[PDB]
Design an enzyme around this catalytic site. Structure first.
Site, PDB file in Angstrom:
ATOM      1  N   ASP A 167       0.796  -1.196   0.000  1.00  0.00           N
ATOM      2  CA  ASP A 167       0.000   0.000   0.000  1.00  0.00           C
ATOM      3  C   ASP A 167       0.841   1.264   0.000  1.00  0.00           C
ATOM      4  O   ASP A 167       1.851   1.310   0.716  1.00  0.00           O
ATOM      5  CB  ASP A 167      -0.908   0.003   1.227  1.00  0.00           C
ATOM      6  CG  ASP A 167      -1.806   1.222   1.280  1.00  0.00           C
ATOM      7  OD1 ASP A 167      -2.688   1.322   0.406  1.00  0.00           O
ATOM      8  OD2 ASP A 167      -1.630   2.076   2.181  1.00  0.00           O
TER       9      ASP A 167
ATOM     10  N   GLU B  26       1.788  -0.485  -4.952  1.00  0.00           N
ATOM     11  CA  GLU B  26       0.786   0.478  -5.392  1.00  0.00           C
ATOM     12  C   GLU B  26       1.474   1.804  -5.637  1.00  0.00           C
ATOM     13  O   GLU B  26       1.810   2.490  -4.662  1.00  0.00           O
ATOM     14  CB  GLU B  26      -0.317   0.695  -4.362  1.00  0.00           C
ATOM     15  CG  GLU B  26      -1.212   1.780  -4.952  1.00  0.00           C
ATOM     16  CD  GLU B  26      -1.888   2.640  -3.907  1.00  0.00           C
ATOM     17  OE1 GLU B  26      -1.414   2.653  -2.756  1.00  0.00           O
ATOM     18  OE2 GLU B  26      -2.883   3.317  -4.238  1.00  0.00           O
TER      19      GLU B  26
HETATM   20  C1  LIG Z   1      -5.564   7.352  -1.483  1.00  0.00           C
HETATM   21  C2  LIG Z   1      -4.277   7.377  -2.307  1.00  0.00           C
HETATM   22  O1  LIG Z   1      -3.660   8.682  -2.176  1.00  0.00           O
HETATM   23  C3  LIG Z   1      -2.429   8.887  -2.898  1.00  0.00           C
HETATM   24  O2  LIG Z   1      -2.702   8.973  -4.306  1.00  0.00           O
HETATM   25  C4  LIG Z   1      -2.432  10.262  -4.880  1.00  0.00           C
HETATM   26  C5  LIG Z   1      -1.504  10.097  -6.100  1.00  0.00           C
HETATM   27  O3  LIG Z   1      -0.287   9.501  -5.711  1.00  0.00           O
HETATM   28  C6  LIG Z   1      -1.214  11.476  -6.722  1.00  0.00           C
HETATM   29  O4  LIG Z   1      -0.375  11.319  -7.850  1.00  0.00           O
HETATM   30  C7  LIG Z   1      -2.531  12.161  -7.144  1.00  0.00           C
HETATM   31  O5  LIG Z   1      -3.117  11.497  -8.246  1.00  0.00           O
HETATM   32  O6  LIG Z   1      -3.463  12.194  -6.037  1.00  0.00           O
HETATM   33  C8  LIG Z   1      -3.757  10.930  -5.392  1.00  0.00           C
HETATM   34  C9  LIG Z   1      -4.770  11.177  -4.250  1.00  0.00           C
HETATM   35  O7  LIG Z   1      -4.174  11.879  -3.177  1.00  0.00           O
HETATM   36  C10 LIG Z   1      -1.396   7.764  -2.601  1.00  0.00           C
HETATM   37  O8  LIG Z   1      -0.322   7.859  -3.511  1.00  0.00           O
HETATM   38  C11 LIG Z   1      -2.023   6.354  -2.694  1.00  0.00           C
HETATM   39  O9  LIG Z   1      -1.081   5.410  -2.241  1.00  0.00           O
HETATM   40  C12 LIG Z   1      -3.297   6.277  -1.823  1.00  0.00           C
HETATM   41  N1  LIG Z   1      -3.953   4.937  -1.951  1.00  0.00           N
HETATM   42  C13 LIG Z   1      -3.590   3.810  -1.004  1.00  0.00           C
HETATM   43  C14 LIG Z   1      -3.150   4.243   0.412  1.00  0.00           C
HETATM   44  C15 LIG Z   1      -3.989   4.867   1.306  1.00  0.00           C
HETATM   45  C16 LIG Z   1      -3.453   5.750   2.416  1.00  0.00           C
HETATM   46  O10 LIG Z   1      -3.165   5.155   3.659  1.00  0.00           O
HETATM   47  C17 LIG Z   1      -5.509   4.457   1.218  1.00  0.00           C
HETATM   48  O11 LIG Z   1      -6.285   5.638   1.399  1.00  0.00           O
HETATM   49  C18 LIG Z   1      -7.424   5.527   2.248  1.00  0.00           C
HETATM   50  O12 LIG Z   1      -7.032   5.658   3.635  1.00  0.00           O
HETATM   51  C19 LIG Z   1      -6.763   6.982   4.149  1.00  0.00           C
HETATM   52  C20 LIG Z   1      -6.375   6.847   5.642  1.00  0.00           C
HETATM   53  O13 LIG Z   1      -7.480   6.452   6.431  1.00  0.00           O
HETATM   54  C21 LIG Z   1      -8.012   7.879   3.946  1.00  0.00           C
HETATM   55  O14 LIG Z   1      -7.803   9.189   4.495  1.00  0.00           O
HETATM   56  C22 LIG Z   1      -8.744   9.503   5.542  1.00  0.00           C
HETATM   57  O15 LIG Z   1      -8.066   9.649   6.817  1.00  0.00           O
HETATM   58  C23 LIG Z   1      -7.215  10.821   6.967  1.00  0.00           C
HETATM   59  C24 LIG Z   1      -6.607  10.790   8.394  1.00  0.00           C
HETATM   60  O16 LIG Z   1      -5.722  11.872   8.612  1.00  0.00           O
HETATM   61  C25 LIG Z   1      -8.038  12.110   6.661  1.00  0.00           C
HETATM   62  O17 LIG Z   1      -7.204  13.258   6.771  1.00  0.00           O
HETATM   63  C26 LIG Z   1      -8.670  12.036   5.257  1.00  0.00           C
HETATM   64  O18 LIG Z   1      -9.459  13.187   5.032  1.00  0.00           O
HETATM   65  C27 LIG Z   1      -9.563  10.780   5.205  1.00  0.00           C
HETATM   66  O19 LIG Z   1     -10.187  10.638   3.938  1.00  0.00           O
HETATM   67  C28 LIG Z   1      -8.285   7.974   2.431  1.00  0.00           C
HETATM   68  O20 LIG Z   1      -9.428   8.780   2.196  1.00  0.00           O
HETATM   69  C29 LIG Z   1      -8.515   6.571   1.812  1.00  0.00           C
HETATM   70  O21 LIG Z   1      -8.521   6.694   0.393  1.00  0.00           O
HETATM   71  C30 LIG Z   1      -5.934   3.763  -0.125  1.00  0.00           C
HETATM   72  O22 LIG Z   1      -7.064   2.944   0.104  1.00  0.00           O
HETATM   73  C31 LIG Z   1      -4.809   2.910  -0.776  1.00  0.00           C
HETATM   74  O23 LIG Z   1      -5.263   2.418  -2.013  1.00  0.00           O
END
Ligand SMILES: C[C@H]1O[C@H](O[C@H]2[C@H](O)[C@@H](O)[C@@H](O)O[C@@H]2CO)[C@H](O)[C@@H](O)[C@@H]1N[C@H]1C=C(CO)[C@@H](O[C@H]2O[C@H](CO)[C@@H](O[C@H]3O[C@H](CO)[C@@H](O)[C@H](O)[C@H]3O)[C@H](O)[C@H]2O)[C@H](O)[C@H]1O
Ligand SMILES: *[C@@H]1O[C@H](CO)[C@@H](O)[C@H](O)[C@H]1NC(C)=O
Ligand SMILES: [Ca+2]
Length: 496
Positions: A197, A233
């Site tokens: 992740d 990822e």
């Molecule tokens: C979501 C995505 O953001 C980037 O992706 C970026 C991308 O790299 C950039 O190039 C551009 O395109 O914008 C994208 C969005 O930010 C990363 O690069 C990529 O790795 C990530 N995806 C993976 C990892 C996380 C995080 O732990 C997970 O998130 C998931 O868990 C997070 C933690 O609970 C969640 O936040 C949540 O909790 C936080 C706690 O402080 C809050 O501030 C936030 O408002 C709340 O939504 C998020 O909403 C959810 O999607 C997700 O399920 C998983 O698949």
């Protein structure tokens, strides 16, 4: 780290998003194994923060509190049972490894965790691991807010908090070891690989250091020398200092350009048309096939939580979704993952779904049981895309044509195309606004084949469309643009 470790002949894995360990155990035995699925992505099996505002959202699972295998999906015994049963029927398990961080810094301290573990974000205290202030990048991050502010700064993306999530100091041997401890425990339990992740927020080198501490797969189910399957990822679309190619040395990577491009082509957005899919794959500027993990949608972007945007197709767009998954499973590029979701009350306001946070089907926080209906479908709001005839059958199609080359491509210069996989399979698509009636060279041996999209080959007969292939491999295909499923697929195993 590039091999899935699926047993001979299984070519896809399915993401049973938010499923309970016990339901997955059953699914392996009663469906996945019999139907030919290679493995399963499970949601984070480690203890996470219990968020009540909103009520138990799905994302509370990406907010680690410890490494105890204790979550809404089940405890450690249920997890082990699941891994055992599934392996025993040849279906692998892949763990969603959330190792870049712990929970949000704004989270209240206390014992609001899935296992009662005590944690205190404000003071950087996670005694159950244990971790303390010395294990986070607080002093390393240079932004005024402490969170990632600019993605054009590779350093910042790695050392600062992703939306407030406490960032672990992965260069410290201590942290590296606490993580490998967790991963080896899972490996010795029997898991075959991991989804890393948020790999974009970790330095390639720190990830490599951690993978070096990992054992070889359990010798009771895997041959000696087996390394866990690793897929990173990394969301890499247009221009950013960070490229997915920087992670090729640790394993495979998520090719997000795949689902985004496919979505627009199939939606026919801005002049895109299926005929352009002739050179689909590297030709479109994607990563090398042997380093790619592909999919149409994932848990994030199917609810607008990640790159892909509006073009992404999901079960909500059933008709076009089946077509996209069909094309994906038929095409030789990358290693495919099928999505399996649950329904949630989408409530669009100003084009944004205010209920994108809703967690899985439940009764007062307790996740619902996956029930199987008389027609093999699911109840309790589980969508079970993997059980859809058109998808399930295409999973099998991939297995049958595996290894076979891409050939016999045909297109009308617009949206109706067709191609085959060696002499083991053939597929045709009609996405134009008019019927498709034409005789095409299929490359399959003469005979009568059952179309696997509209029906099945059940005991000597087809329950749907039947195609007749002559001696020269030709066969006639007719697909009205009004068909429920505007595409036909036949393979060696659907021949009567
Ligand atoms: C979501 C995505 O953001 C980037 O992706 C970026 C991308 O790299 C950039 O190039 C551009 O395109 O914008 C994208 C969005 O930010 C990363 O690069 C990529 O790795 C990530 N995806 C993976 C990892 C996380 C995080 O732990 C997970 O998130 C998931 O868990 C997070 C933690 O609970 C969640 O936040 C949540 O909790 C936080 C706690 O402080 C809050 O501030 C936030 O408002 C709340 O939504 C998020 O909403 C959810 O999607 C997700 O399920 C998983 O698949
Ligand atoms: C196929 O179905 C028909 C009835 O629709 C039956 O007459 C025929 O014998 C069946 N073929 C086989 C091989 O069972
Ligand atoms: Ca980081």
């Amino acid at each position: 780290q590039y091999s899935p470790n699926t047993q001979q002949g299984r070519t896809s894995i399915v993401h049973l998003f938010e499923w309970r360990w016990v339901d997955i155990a059953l699914e392996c035995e009663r469906y996945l194994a019999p139907k030919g699925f290679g493995g399963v992505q499970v949601s984070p099996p480690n203890e996470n923060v219990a968020i009540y505002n909103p009520f138990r959202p799905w994302w509370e699972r990406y907010q680690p509190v410890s490494y105890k295998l204790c979550t809404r999906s089940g405890n450690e015994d249920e997890f082990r049972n699941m891994v055992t049963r599934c392996n025993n029927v040849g279906v692998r398990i892949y763990v969603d490894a959330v190792i870049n961080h712990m929970c949000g810094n704004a989270v209240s301290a206390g014992t609001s965790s899935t296992c009662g573990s005590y944690f205190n974000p404000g003071s950087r205290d996670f005694p159950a691991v244990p971790y303390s202030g010395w294990d986070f990048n607080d002093g390393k991050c240079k932004t005024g807010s402490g969170d990632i502010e600019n993605y054009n700064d590779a350093t910042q993306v790695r050392d600062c908090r992703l939306t407030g999530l406490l960032d672990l100091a992965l260069e410290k041997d201590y942290v590296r070891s606490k993580i490998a401890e967790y991963m080896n425990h899972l490996i010795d339990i029997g898991v075959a690989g991991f989804r890393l992740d948020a790999s974009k927020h970790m330095w390639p080198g720190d990830i490599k250091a951690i993978l070096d501490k990992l054992h070889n797969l359990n010798s009771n189910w895997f041959p000696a020398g087996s390394k866990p399957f690793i897929y990173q990822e990394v969301i890499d679309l247009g221009g950013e200092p960070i490229k997915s190619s920087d992670y090729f040395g640790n394993g495979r990577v998520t090719e997000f350009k795949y689902g985004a491009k496919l979505g627009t082509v199939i939606r026919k957005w801005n002049g895109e048309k299926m005929s352009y899919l002739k050179n689909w794959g590297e030709g479109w500027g994607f990563v090398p096939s042997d380093r790619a993990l592909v999919f149409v949608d994932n848990h994030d972007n199917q609810r607008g939580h990640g790159a892909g945007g509006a073009s992404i197709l999901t079960f909500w767009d059933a008709r076009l979704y089946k077509m996209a998954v069909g094309f994906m499973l038929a095409h030789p590029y990358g290693f495919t993952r099928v999505m399996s979701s649950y329904r949630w009350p989408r409530q669009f306001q100003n084009g944004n779904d205010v209920n994108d946070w809703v967690g899985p089907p439940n009764n007062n926080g307790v996740i619902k049981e996956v029930t199987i209906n008389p027609d093999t479908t699911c109840g309790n709001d589980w969508v079970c895309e993997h059980r859809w005839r058109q998808i399930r059958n295409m999973v099998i199609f991939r297995n049958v044509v595996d290894g076979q080359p891409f050939t016999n491509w045909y297109d009308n210069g617009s949206n109706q195309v067709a191609f085959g996989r060696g002499n083991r399979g053939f597929i045709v698509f009609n996405n134009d606004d008019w019927s498709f009636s034409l005789t095409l060279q299929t490359g399959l041996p003469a005979g009568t084949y059952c179309d696997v999209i509209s029906g099945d080959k059940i005991n000597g007969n087809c329950t749907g469309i039947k195609i007749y292939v002559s001696d020269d491999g030709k066969a006639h295909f007719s697909i009205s643009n009004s068909a429920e499923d505007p595409f036909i697929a036949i393979h060696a195993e659907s021949k009567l």
